[PDB]
Amino acid sequence: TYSPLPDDYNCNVELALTSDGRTIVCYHPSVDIPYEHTKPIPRPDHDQVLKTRLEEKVEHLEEGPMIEQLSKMFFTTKHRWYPHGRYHRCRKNLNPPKDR
Amino acid sequence: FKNKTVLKKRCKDCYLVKRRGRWYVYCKTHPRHKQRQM
């Protein structure tokens, strides 16, 4: 019943050796999440005469309150939300190389 | 209370006691024998 690592989270590792002992065999089949460990997705979320037309709710906010709201929802600091000058905006490479 | 690096009893009534981190010498018979470890 010996196991170097618990075969519960990632895979079932089974160490082995060859007859000559010149190669180590590692059979590690992937483990599947049991059906009993998951939660169902939350699918659910009158006398009206006028149709509910889409109403714009873009409230005007100053530079201060706008950054404070952003810094709380993304859990960052206010410093990154301030703009930068033209000198830095021109040094940025708009066509960077891409890998994979 | 006289501060002394080395605390020495000055009579048979002086007794050592450990209080507040430093040794003290108390002597009810002779109040001038009281000492505080420096």
Partner: protein
């Protein structure tokens, strides 16, 4: 009912790490054969997809797979397009099975072949040395030769048993 070496359970009476019992070598020896045979049986039937192999080339270990590129900082004295075999393979792995060399796999177990596709010089490298107040200043530019290899195929053979 206490042995001469008995110690009552305290904080330091026993080692903090739990006791570990290794399997019986006689029992485990045949258990290894069962695992090796199962993995060997996965090779004859071709129950594997893409394979990644770790090879030792140019004093360097490359985690390469098929149809990828590797840049080598020296000339191999080989014409472009020639197909060669990388003899040293230290690790071959798949989605479900992995084989380890000690420290190298046998030539009868794994075969990795590459192709010379481009031989070019490196971009100019600046080598400059400067010392203050000593009038010591000299600049050197070097272009080390380079070679690009593309791994074509990584195939294994059922020789575990």
């Amino acid at each position: 009912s206490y042995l001469p070496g008995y110690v009552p359970k305290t904080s330091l009476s026993s080692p903090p790490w739990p006791e570990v019992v290794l399997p019986d070598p006689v029992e485990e020896t045949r258990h290894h054969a069962e695992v090796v045979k199962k993995v060997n049986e996965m090779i004859v039937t071709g129950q594997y997809g893409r394979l990644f192999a770790v090879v030792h080339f140019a004093s360097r270990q490359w985690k390469v797979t098929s149809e990828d590129l590797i840049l080598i900082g020296n000339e191999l004295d080989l014409a472009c397009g020639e197909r060669i075999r990388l003899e040293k393979v230290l690790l071959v792995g798949a989605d479900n099975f992995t084989l380890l060399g000690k420290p190298l796999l046998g030539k009868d177990l794994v075969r990795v072949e590459a192709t010379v596709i481009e031989k070019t010089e490196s971009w100019p490298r600046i080598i400059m040395r400067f010392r203050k107040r000593k009038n010591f200043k000299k600049k050197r530019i070097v272009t080390t030769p380079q070679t690009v290899l593309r791994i074509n195929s990584i195939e294994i053979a059922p020789c575990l048993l």
